[PDB]
């Protein structure tokens, strides 16, 4: 059943965008109870959108921008890689970036 | 089989006739109160060609059965509606439906 | 509980004698002055003399003819008596049993308050 | 036939994929049979909030009462956005009864965005149909159009006999309500659900009316006390937008319709001492002396021509020298204020000393310009002062005065206007005294307050002589937010002075409780300054309006710190600390409990700037503010005063149910007892019990000791019986059943305080041709119905009240010990009926629900459980349990409110009322109970988060590994705008 792609495809990124910054700001309530159950879902509808090839290119530059802004950036305060992250959203992480 | 219970009515003139696509913003709701289909969470009105035999029959009828702009409730019996075996896992087998149907537009 | 049963006003010319009746049976006080309250088509509820329990009579708005206001006290009976009807009295006459003798009041608001009206009779004037 | 259990669901959904190969017979066959009822699972969709706004217009009806009976107004609809969002936006106008229209934003009956109908207590009516008790029924109209801009409906409320009438533009519509119950006080509302533009019409200066009133129908702005100004408010609210922030608001002090009817105090019988003869006779010339005074200062200045003619009414001096008529009513004067002295409790005195002749007995002015003008006051303010108290009783006697007016004036039949009209004999003080307005006052006491005063100069020895569980709200922090370990400062601010005790509670707290009488909390009262823990106990010191507590929590060293303007409240013995030893258990939470009329700010500390006083006392002690950094507000919760059955616990200190299983000769029975009963501490109160699972009428009202198997296997006749147990009085009890809407906690209940409502539709001629009616429970009056007998009143027999309920005719016939009783109802297709008893105990042993059959005759199991749908064998499945009817429950207070703008637009613009930005809800309707709550909810709720975190799974295992089919079959239940919304949402 159809959904709309490119609806999913700009809210999954801004959501994601919210989502490390909200991390972060040192959320003392993060958005699922965690840190893990704020990130994982989002990482997993991430993962699977890219994959399924939905995301652009500047999506794709914006995410990558994301995950890491130190080498990303063509020539996110603080990548989704520095931050403390749990085992679960480490293996969302290593999904996407395999 | 089928009525129509005007909820707002519309302009009264131009009826949809045999040969052209109908858009709608249908709100499928069952026998029981228990709603299973809108197309506005969809965000997309239900744009079908009239007579192409692609809708259930009730609602082919009650759509020629009404006007533009005019809202109203297409009662489609099981009769006229999936009926003996239902929609698998949406409507239950020998149902009664009931549509909160509005003509927004055509073409 | 204070009903003030008021009979029909008969039709009839100018400067023709005629007797109101009106009884005010309930309680036995606040009763004292039973005078007239007529109101007028679109005007305001002229006052009829209040004569007291004891029939004295006082000057009021409304007295531009007799409107010699007898009260039998023996049935508490007010029998407002006008000889000379004038195109001013065809209005609907009201009888008020009111608790203040002759407009006298040394007495409280509330108490001020307590005035009973009457049913209402409209003696037109021919 | 077990209850919402998730290992159920764990079974479904490891039947659905077997090792990474999906079965697709087991999936498609699970997603047939459990997904198309909707009746197991709980149903989540996006529902919108609906918001309602009422003038403070209150009229009701009561036996001699001063509100009018007939009263009308008009809504003028100037915009409406039609599907603003995916709904349709909800529009209604009606009346409501103050006693129990309670529209909390978010969640309720149904699906929720409960408005002017959903509920028995409000009427109301959208374009097409009217509304109530969540029904809707189309009604004809011309337009027969749903509200759109440009229309006026006119309503009209009789209530001498009960009618609610709708007009719209002009033309009236063809059905009314009738025969409604009139307890309590109607009032004008309007709901509407956001893009919608209305503007109230009142009449008079408050709204111009577009069309004609009713003949006999008076204008609704007639019916403002004088005490107060007409304007447009919400019904209920829990908060309020005040500048510094958010303010919870507690309940309200709602007026009733016995507030109205006045209630003197008889002096008629109140003899009369000899002090009538020796006081009153003077006491009644100083009252002419003091009409006579008020005369002679201009105004009414007397002239000789005639005795009382225009201004010139004071005569014959100061004395009573009048004929004997007026002679007695001058004398009657203050020996009527010594009658009703004597019946409120003044004691009649007399002067031992001499006061009389202390009392000088000429005014000072002595301008006395004529014989009548000479006037002797005694200057009895210059001798003797008014005590407080003897205003007091001023005020009480002004007060019995006034009553016994308003009591001759209903009487004669005056009722109240605020508009003054005497050949309409309507009043605008025609209220009761404690209703009127001050000037009204000072002029009904103008001349008691100096006879009163007068009397104690002549030496008198005068002397002095809502709901339950619905007083307070407690707002409390959500228990996600419960502290272990750490300092916290959370501050709370008093805009009104009164009961709003501010402390920690513990997670478990019970709402009913009033907060700090139990262990589960640490508050203090500032109202007094007491601390609650166990009780009551001294401390600190009462406040202000506008003073601030800073309570604090020290985890690590065991201790609470309440502080008032930065000031640290000090016990009784002289510590800081109110509470020095407090265990850290299972955490604490920032609560309140406001009382009723109060205002307080519940500032956790989102801002540190916002809070003030935290730099005085908190900071640099260690003390981080409460939700400093937590971004979002803290969701708060709110004792809900809304009665809602829940099962009964098994750990109540006071009731148990007992499972009797079925035997022989015996049906499947659940015996309630009450545990305690003859002891100390007996709560013997009425108790409202019903079954969990309801019957389902037949949707398609069809016209439709051996045992036949035929007629058992067609009939539609399932019942049940209610075995009273000997002890039990019959006169408390109430055999029955109630539809899931049934929120009536009333401790004295009887079958005339049930809800009810006939829609009587007829048509253009007037002639009916539907009545139909409407209850929110319909049982037969055990509490007067039972056997005669002149001894034996402790029966042998049970009472065994059958309760025949024809599912396909709708017949629900009663009876009891064999005989049929002349009880029978009728009900609507599609309704859901739960067995119910209403019983006040009276035994150790009261009552069971005898779940049985008969002569053909099939069984209850059968009609709750589809399983068991053809199966006699009475059963009593752990589904089937007992549920009292709790007073009081949690809710989740939203975090966003549907902001609405009211302002008076103009005489001829009445007033306008204008919702425009839309805000939604993902409901979870529970399918056998009729009743939607929010989603967001569940985060306390663990027990319904479970059983839906395993349902979601389900769907997941269903739709699992390329079933495209039961995807498709996935999107008519869970559709992709609550999944969005559920993707967005971050509570």
Known sequence: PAIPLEALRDKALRMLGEAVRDGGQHARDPVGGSVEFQFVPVLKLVSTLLVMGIFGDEDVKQILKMIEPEVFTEELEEGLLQMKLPESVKLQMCNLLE | ?107 | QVQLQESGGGLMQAGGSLRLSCTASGSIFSINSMGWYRQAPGKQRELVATITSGNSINYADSVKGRFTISRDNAKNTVYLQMNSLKPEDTAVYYCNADRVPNGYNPWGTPNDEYDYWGQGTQVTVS | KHGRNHKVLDVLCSLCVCNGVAVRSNQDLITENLLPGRELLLQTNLINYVTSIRPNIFVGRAEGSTQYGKWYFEVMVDEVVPFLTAQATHLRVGWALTEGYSPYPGGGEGWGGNGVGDDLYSYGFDGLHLWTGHVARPVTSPGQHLLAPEDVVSCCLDLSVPSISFRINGCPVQGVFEAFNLDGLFFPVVSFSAGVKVRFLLGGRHGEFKFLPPPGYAPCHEAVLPRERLRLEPIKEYRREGPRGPHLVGPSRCLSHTDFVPCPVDTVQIVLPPHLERIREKLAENIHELWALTRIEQGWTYGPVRDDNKRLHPCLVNFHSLPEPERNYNLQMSGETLKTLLALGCHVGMADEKAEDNLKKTKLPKTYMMSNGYKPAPLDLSHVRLTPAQTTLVDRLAENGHNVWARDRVAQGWSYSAVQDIPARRNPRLVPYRLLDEATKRSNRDSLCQAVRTLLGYGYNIEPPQSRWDRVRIFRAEKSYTVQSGRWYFEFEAVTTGEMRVGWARPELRPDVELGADELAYVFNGHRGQRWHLGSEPFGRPWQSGDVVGCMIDLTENTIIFTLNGEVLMSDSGSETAFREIEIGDGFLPVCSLGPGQVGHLNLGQDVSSLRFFAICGLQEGFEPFAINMQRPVTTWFSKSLPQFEPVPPEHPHYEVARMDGTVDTPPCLRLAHRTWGSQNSLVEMLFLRLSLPVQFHQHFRCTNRDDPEIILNTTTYYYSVRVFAGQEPSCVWVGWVTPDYHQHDMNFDLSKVRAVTVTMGDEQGNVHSSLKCSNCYMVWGGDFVSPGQQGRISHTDLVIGCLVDLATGLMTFTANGKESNTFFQVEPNTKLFPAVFVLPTHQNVIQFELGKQKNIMPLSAAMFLSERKNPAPQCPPRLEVQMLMPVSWSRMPNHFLQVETRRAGERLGWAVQCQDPLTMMALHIPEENRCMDILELSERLDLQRFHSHTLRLYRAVCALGNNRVAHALCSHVDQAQLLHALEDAH
């Open chain 2, 1 to 107: 089989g089928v009525e129509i219970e005007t909820i707002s009515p519309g302009d009264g003139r131009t009826f949809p006739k045999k040969g052209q696509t109908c858009v709608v913003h249908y709100t499928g709701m069952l026998q029981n109160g228990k709603k299973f289909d809108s197309s506005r969470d969809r965000n997309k009105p239900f744009k079908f060609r009239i007579g192409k035999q692609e809708v259930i029959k009730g609602f082919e009828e009650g759509a020629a059965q009404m006007s533009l702009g005019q809202r109203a409730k297409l009662t489609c019996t099981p009769d006229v509606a999936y009926g003996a075996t239902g929609h698998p896992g949406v409507i239950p087998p020998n149902a009664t439906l009931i549509f909160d149907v509005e003509l927004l537009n055509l073409e």
